[PDB]
Amino acid sequence: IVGGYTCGANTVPYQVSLNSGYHFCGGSLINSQWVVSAAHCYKSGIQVRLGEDNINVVEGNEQFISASKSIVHPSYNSNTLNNDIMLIKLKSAASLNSRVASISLPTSCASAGTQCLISGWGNTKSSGTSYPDVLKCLKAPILSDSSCKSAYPGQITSNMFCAGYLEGGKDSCQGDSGGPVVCSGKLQGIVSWGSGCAQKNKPGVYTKVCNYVSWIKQTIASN
Amino acid sequence: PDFCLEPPYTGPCAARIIRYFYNAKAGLCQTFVYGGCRAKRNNFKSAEDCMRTCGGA
Ligand SMILES: [Ca+2]
To answer: Burial, A145: exposed, middle or buried (Cβ in 10 Å; 0-12, 13-18, 19+)?
Structure first.
């Protein structure tokens, strides 16, 4: 997260880290056994780390639980990035508490201008590389589909939205993928892609979760 | 054009996945951050794979 702020320990209790010997993506806890992330975060052998703040230290509220299933959307297109969503089943159910909690799925799509919270352990520099110890947060608005298409001609599908600031300086970045965009207590987005990080005229692009709610519920239930 | 001589490509996705690329200036396979999509060919999951494909380019 570039241009954000330190969340505070366990203030985003649905945020998880996906670990393959190191942190490589985020995700969002949606019930005690299931996490939502990005399809491009697929790896075999994922360990989900819940209750994290400092990801480089064991602080006392962590739960480390291996993935038992990592299910990419059956129509994910690795060229166009359409349908960039994945569901991870936990091998055992997480213990839910004040520091480990699920986030609700949306009941309807969010509109342009709606303010959201984006979080992750990704790079904090727009030029260069600095990875944080603790979780970072950013407040950013959903942008219009028209503005998103203007920023990225030919690239934005009905399952994507832009969020952020056209002047630059505030965005998601490498290591934030798969993590949450939460608006009014609902998971509306998944960190997906962009053009650089926090560059002028190049807002971040996010998977539009409201389009997948029926698929998420049915897939969870049939696995 | 030898794909082993191309600079490493992070791409547009926002993962932080460690991959290998052949660094012809240094003469060795090195790590870099791959964003998770649209990989170019100078991008390997292990140093062994990179050395096998590109070593001595
Ligand atoms: Ca920790």
So the answer is: middle
- The answer for residues whose C-beta is within 8 angstroms of residue A27's C-beta and 6 or more apart is A15, A16, A17, A18, A35, A36, A37, A41, A48, A88, A178, A179
Domain A1-12+103-210 CATH superfamily: Trypsin-like serine proteases (2.40.10.10)
Q: Given an 8 Å threshold on Cβ–Cβ distance, is B14 in contact with A129?
A: no
Separation of CA A32 from chain center: 17
Question: Could you tell me the fold of the domain covering A13-102+211-222?
Answer: Thrombin, subunit H (2.40.10)
Cross-chain CB nearest to B14 (options A78, A129, A173): A173
Q: Taking CB atoms and an 8 Å limit, are A193 and B15 in contact across chains?
A: no
A167 appears as a binding residue in the annotation: no
Element (H, E) at B20: strand B17-23
| Contacts B33 to A, Cβ<8 Å | 129, 174
